[PDB]
RNA sequence: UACAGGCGAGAGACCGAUAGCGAACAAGUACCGCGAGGGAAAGAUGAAAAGGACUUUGAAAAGAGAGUCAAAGAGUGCUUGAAAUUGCCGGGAGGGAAGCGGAUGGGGGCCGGCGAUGCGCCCCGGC
RNA sequence: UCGUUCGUCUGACUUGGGUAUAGGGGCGAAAGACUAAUCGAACCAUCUAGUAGCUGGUUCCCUCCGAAGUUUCCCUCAGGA
RNA sequence: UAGGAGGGCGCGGCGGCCGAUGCAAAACCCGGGGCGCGAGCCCGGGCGGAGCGGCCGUCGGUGCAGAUCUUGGUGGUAGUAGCAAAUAUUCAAAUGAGAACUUUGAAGGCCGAAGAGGAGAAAGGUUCCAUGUGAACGGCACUUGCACAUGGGUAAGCCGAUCCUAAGGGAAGGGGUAACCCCGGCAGAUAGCGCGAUCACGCGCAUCCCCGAAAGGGAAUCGGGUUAAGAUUUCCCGAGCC
RNA sequence: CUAUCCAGCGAAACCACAGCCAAGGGAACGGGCUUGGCGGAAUCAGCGGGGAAAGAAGACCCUGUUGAGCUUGACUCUAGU
RNA sequence: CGACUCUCGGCAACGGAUAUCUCGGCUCUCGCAUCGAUGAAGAACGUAGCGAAAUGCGAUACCUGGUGUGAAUUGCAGAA
């Protein structure tokens, strides 16, 4: 529909947007995060990377609890970081669409760069958990808004 | 100003009256007016409309669109009007919707009980002005 | 003479969806309790479904183009669409709080009723 | 509730189903125990918006005036005249 | 301060007056400009798409920061606490978009028969069986399912109920009761009369009606087959019985 | 077997604002005030000193012209006999 | 230059306030007098080409009949 940004030039721009997407704000939010501005080819190998658990994503606003490890040393020195799986899957889907999309237009697939990404939260979908002495907690999932946009880079 | 204390003046029970009335009663709701030809040869201003009558649009953006009835599609309020359509996006054909107060009946389906209905509301309209 | 029931009416300086009856809606419903009983939430696309053909990516949901419409950014829980809280972009500051009151200095951002050019003598040349 | 350890096990034994006793009532090898997670009097609705000298709260601006903790009486001393 | 009064501001109707609005009303938004000591007010820009405002009088369910206030929504906590009983899985292949979790085969283990096996009573009610399936749900996942959708499926003279009585319950006349109701042995032409007769009459009438057990009492069945799902004895074949 | 690290999933209690100390004064034991000591991003695992930590309108004690269970030589009655 | 925290603005979310409504409610006033053994009120089960609920009806089952009106019902299909 309308993005939070429009295209700084729209003729070389393609863009793919998913909405209440099951999969966890917090981690897809720092997935995003890490990629902005980057070119397309890097982007999907670092995102398949983390797939293959050999690069991974830095944690830095949701970070209480994250465990440390030496893979995101060059990126955040504290080496706070994960591989956020399913984060990474989702975003390659739209990543991929929003290259099929240039294709169709006709925008040089390998000048595109990431010009724009954002998550949102989404509505919030309900089940329950049982607790000592007969009773009831929410169990609650936390879906996310995903928008994105390539940019043919310019000299 | 009403006289008979009958008759209810209450927006509320005016509107439950029009939006739940029965068939037989948005026959005459449905109703419309003669055109200035008919009006001058049987001297009467409305009727309700019928199934075969032939129209004129005269308030829509179909204003000027000429026809024949099809439908009274009473449970709408509605009547479609032969031609009068447009299309929809997959490039199927609808009938699109007109209010009997927006059109002019140019020509009459008549009938036995059509003669005598025209004849009911002339010796009428005749009764008071003489 | 009386008349919170029944049926049939007519009104109002009444309420306007957390209000008004518990119930504007398949409301004494769903649901709970062995039972007597208890008892909700929930209205609004558009004038008209004209409710989005077709192409392309995808396992799909969907997306990107497009099409309808005055409008879809009015897209089947759809008029408007506040706040709390959240994301992105741009800017600013930080040695165990922050915010606040008075001063002013630096940046911003904005203000043309933000700030005037007219009145008196005169000489024509016409009204 | 779970684990280990314990009491009893031919008896005043264990147990299903049927049936009887209902709230100042029942039933009790008696602990005020039990009577549907409710018992020194169950639960449900109503009287009922019960009463409270006691606790909490009590919604816009400016301007003007501006206190008392003292007297007397009160089953009066956290109250009122 | 407690407290009293005056003059104003603001909200919603009613009686009157004066007006705005599809050449864009209300509401809402803003680092926009101003007025007022202040309550508040006026204008600009935007959004929206059809109503609204000022003045005089008058009226009221008329002004919120609190009440462990009411209802709704939302944070930080926090991607944290946590997902640890019941010994246990592994290899190939198939399937599929996707397999640690589905299926087949092989191996290794467990329940160890007072069983984690095979069948019932209560209770449930379609969970049974086949085919298919987007979401949700199955606190990871799933091609999967006790989920969702569409269909199908329960066959009896012999198994039961049904019959009989138990503890016990209800009950007609009668007794009580303001009445609802409470009393069954109190004994009343007690309900019903029973039996032989019909081609009519006779006899006898005693402790007496009903309910109450899918574990008590009790007419009668066995073996072999058959379905995706019914039957060991309901269907088919044969053979019997009441 | 946990805790620990990873993929997936994912609560709650609590919450004026917060969160380094010493002395002073103060509602007589301060995180904030006064005066001193100091004080450098961002993170992980633990711990039980403090937050007079959470839980619950103290059950002890007092007050109230609030009750209730029980008793009797309390007052006033009452079924029974 | 950066990360984090706080903050200002623009845009986008979250949520359903506000405004504008309203076949509903509340209040007042008026008229009338009509359940049942000739089986009522209430309960149950059925009933439509495609229906679960509500509404309606009863094996004549979202109706049969008469009368009035006078050409539809409608989500789709069909006799018309
Ligand atoms: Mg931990
Ligand atoms: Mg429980
Ligand atoms: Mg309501
Ligand atoms: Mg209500
Ligand atoms: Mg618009
Ligand atoms: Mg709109
Ligand atoms: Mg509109
Ligand atoms: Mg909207
Ligand atoms: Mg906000
Ligand atoms: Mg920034
Ligand atoms: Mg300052
Ligand atoms: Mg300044
Ligand atoms: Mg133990
Ligand atoms: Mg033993
Ligand atoms: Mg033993
Ligand atoms: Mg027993
Ligand atoms: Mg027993
Ligand atoms: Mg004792
Ligand atoms: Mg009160
Ligand atoms: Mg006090
Ligand atoms: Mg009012
Ligand atoms: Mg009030
Ligand atoms: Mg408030
Ligand atoms: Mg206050
Ligand atoms: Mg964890
Ligand atoms: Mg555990
Ligand atoms: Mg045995
Ligand atoms: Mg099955
Ligand atoms: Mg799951
Ligand atoms: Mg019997
Ligand atoms: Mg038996
Ligand atoms: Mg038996
Ligand atoms: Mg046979
Ligand atoms: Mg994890
Ligand atoms: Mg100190
Ligand atoms: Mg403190
Ligand atoms: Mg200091
Ligand atoms: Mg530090
Ligand atoms: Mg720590
Ligand atoms: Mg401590
Ligand atoms: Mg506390
Ligand atoms: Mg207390
Ligand atoms: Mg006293
Ligand atoms: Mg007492
Ligand atoms: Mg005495």
């Not at chain 1, 995003?32 to 830095?58: C, G, T, W």
């Not at chain 1, 607790?131 to 609650?140: C, E, K, L």
Request: glycine residues 4%; charged residues 30%; contains cysteine.
């Amino acid at each position: 529909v309308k993005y939070s940004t429009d295209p700084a030039n729209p003729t070389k721009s393609a863009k793919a947007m998913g909405r209440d997407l099951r999969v966890h704000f917090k981690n897809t939010r720092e997935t995003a995060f890490a990629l902005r501005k980057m070119s397309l080819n890097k982007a999907k190998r670092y995102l398949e990377d983390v797939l293959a658990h050999k690069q991974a994503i830095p944690f830095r606003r949701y970070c209480r609890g994250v465990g440390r490890t030496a893979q995101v040393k060059n990126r955040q020195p504290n080496g706070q970081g994960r591989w956020p799986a399913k984060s990474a899957k989702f975003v390659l889907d739209l990543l991929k669409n929003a290259e099929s999309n240039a294709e169709v237009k006709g925008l040089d697939v390998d000048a595109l760069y990431i010009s724009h990404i954002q998550v949102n939260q989404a509505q919030k979908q309900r089940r329950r958990t049982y607790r000592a002495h007969g009773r009831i907690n929410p169990y609650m999932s936390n879906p996310c808004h995903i928008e994105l946009i390539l940019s043919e880079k310019e000299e | 100003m009403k006289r008979n204390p009958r008759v209810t003046s209450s927006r509320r029970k005016c509107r439950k009256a029009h939006f739940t009335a029965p068939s037989s009663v948005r026959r005459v709701l449905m109703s419309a007016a003669l055109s200035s030809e008919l009006r001058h040869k049987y001297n009467v201003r409305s009727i309700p409309i019928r199934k075969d009558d032939e129209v004129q649009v005269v308030r829509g953006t179909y204003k000027g669109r000429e026809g024949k009835v099809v439908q009274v599609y009473r449970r709408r309020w509605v009547i479609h009007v032969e031609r009068i359509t447009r299309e929809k996006v997959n490039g199927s054909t609808v009938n699109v919707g007109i209010h009997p107060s927006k059109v002019i009946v140019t020509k009459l389906k008549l009938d036995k009980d059509r003669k005598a209905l025209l004849d009911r509301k002339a010796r009428g309209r005749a009764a008071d002005k003489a």
